[PDB]
Amino acid sequence: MNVNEFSNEFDVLYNNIMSNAAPGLNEYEKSVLLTKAQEEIVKNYFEPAGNKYGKGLDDSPKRQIDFSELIKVGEGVLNTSAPTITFDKRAKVYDLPADLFLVINEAVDTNAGTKQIVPISYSDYTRLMSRPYKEPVKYQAWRIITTSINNISVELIVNSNETITDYKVRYIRRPAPIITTNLSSEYGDVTINGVSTVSECELNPIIHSEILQRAVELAKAAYQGDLQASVELGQRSE
Amino acid sequence: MTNKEFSDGFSTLLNSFGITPNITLDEYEKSTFLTNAQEQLIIDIYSGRNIIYGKSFEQTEEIRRYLSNLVETYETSTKVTGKLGLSKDSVFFEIPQDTWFITYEVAFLKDSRLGCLDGIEASVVPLPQDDLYRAKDNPFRGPSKDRVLRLDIKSDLAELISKYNVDKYLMRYISQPTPIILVDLPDGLSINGVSTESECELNPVVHRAILERAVQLAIISKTQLT
């Protein structure tokens, strides 16, 4: 469904049938609520505990097809542009793509073959570095986030006497906002995520109805406006 | 194996800092268990009470190769003067004080009474105190030109009962092994009086058995009340 259909069925589901009908929502408000509902839905469906099914990214066909249009593959750029201080002397710093929402798969291609990057926790890092070896298992590499400015910088730890040729990252692209109409105005240009032009929902049509329902629920919680509704509907932001 | 290798292998065998429940020891604790395992193992090997080997001090090539580096030879001619013995012809010789078990022990005799046999090497026979009285007069098991009786007494001493004058006393014994100390211990701490690093002097063949025994002793120490 295109943006006009988002807005028309938003109006239908919000106030065109309600008995003591409420004021219609302005297009900026509808775009804001739709973008919020989109992000909430993405976060709810990525995490199993966030939805009533207990199903995350790839726990069912529907969850695969939900994020299928939001998956992207890119590469981390070696961060030798400027000097820096790494926590580990034997780690190579890489910069992830700017439009990164969530990392789901990483791999590094070295001279000793491809290796799956395992994101190790800080307590896990301490445990592993208290051991005599201090290097990954055969077909794996280690990873920790380092000092990041304006984009995520990442330290890749591989086994000794190994060089990294490329660093691929299969991630979830940051969703683009849903903007119903050109938000340009003479009184001031308002933006949802830095863009005023019309922006279609760049995800699969399977969850457009879900985004619409969530947006309507958020609109009605805003209309109710007491602390109660804000608190319970803020639980699903996550 | 070196001290770094004792420590790294000991950690690997104990699964230190692995995901499963495990045990982690300090280098002093590691040194304590390694030295205890070393001394237990070599005493059991000498006496032949180890069920795995089941052989005594030099009963096979394996045990020879294991305890070859503790075998020290000693020679002395000085006699301790003022001491009370069980015979008029008793001379006392000091023991090297690092001795564990005496394995060979022989005595050279210098006396004019045994003519043209002077300097005869004589077998030093350890004799119990039951056997002493009936062995002074014994012509086949008592002191003679070719036999000397040795009795252990206080203050690390050997009372040699001989018919002829004893000139020199030769020994070959098992020595106190150097402890296995993996790190320069802080002030006050030491193992067998040693505070600095001490590598195992035995052969690398038995180092892995010592490591296994030390690991088992560590598990016993941590899991004897649970």
3-state secondary structure B22-40: CCCCCHHHHHHHHHHHHHH
Measured CA to CA in angstroms, residue A203 lies from A24, A34, A60, A210, A214 at distances of 26, 13, 18, 12, 15
| Closest by Cα among B181, B163, B152 to B120 | B163
Calpha distance A235→A132 (Å, rounded): 44
Beta bridge partners of B149: B125, B161
Question: Burial, A213: exposed, middle or buried (Cβ in 10 Å; 0-12, 13-18, 19+)?
Answer: middle
Angle between the B207-222 and B3-14 helix axes, to the nearest 10 degrees? 50
* Interface contacts (A, B; CB < 8 Å): 12
Q: What is the dihedral of CA A90, A95, A100, A101, to 10 degrees?
A: 30
User: Cβ–Cβ of A127/B17 closer than 8 Å?
Assistant: yes
Residue in chain A lying closest to B16 (CA): A131
Contact B124, B148 (CB under 8 A): yes
Calpha distance A120→A213 (Å, rounded): 38
Structural biology method used? cryo-EM
Contacts of A127 in chain B (CB under 8 A): 17
Our CA-based measurement puts residue A5 at a distance from the nearest CA of chain B, in whole angstroms, of: 53
Residue in chain A lying closest to B9 (CA): A132
- Cα-atom radius of gyration of chain B, to the nearest Å? 23
Calpha distance B30→B218 (Å, rounded): 8
Calpha distance B211→A103 (Å, rounded): 44
Enumerate chain B positions whose Cβ falls within 8 A of a Cβ in A.
Answer: 7-8, 11-12, 16-18
Please state whether beta strands A71-75 and B147-153 pair in parallel, antiparallel, or not at all (unpaired): unpaired
Residue in chain B lying closest to A130 (CA): B17
Calpha distance A128→A159 (Å, rounded): 13
Q: What angle do CA A164, A165, A170 make, to 5 degrees?
A: 90
| Nearest Cβ partner for B8 among A127, A130, A132 | A132
3-state secondary structure of B98: coil
- Backbone discontinuities in chain A, residue before each (C to N > 2.5 A): none
Calpha distance A7→A181 (Å, rounded): 10
User: Cβ–Cβ of B16/A127 closer than 8 Å?
Assistant: no
Contact A103, A46 (CB under 8 A): no
Within 10 A of A226 (CB to CB), how many other CB atoms are there? 8
- Percentage helix, strand, coil for chain B under 3-state DSSP, each rounded to 5: 30, 25, 45
DSSP state letter for A91: E
**Phi/psi at A218 (5° precision):** -65, -40
Residue in chain B lying closest to A131 (CA): B17
Contacts of A128 in chain B (CB under 8 A): 17
Our CA-based measurement puts residue A167 at a distance from the nearest CA of chain B, in whole angstroms, of: 28
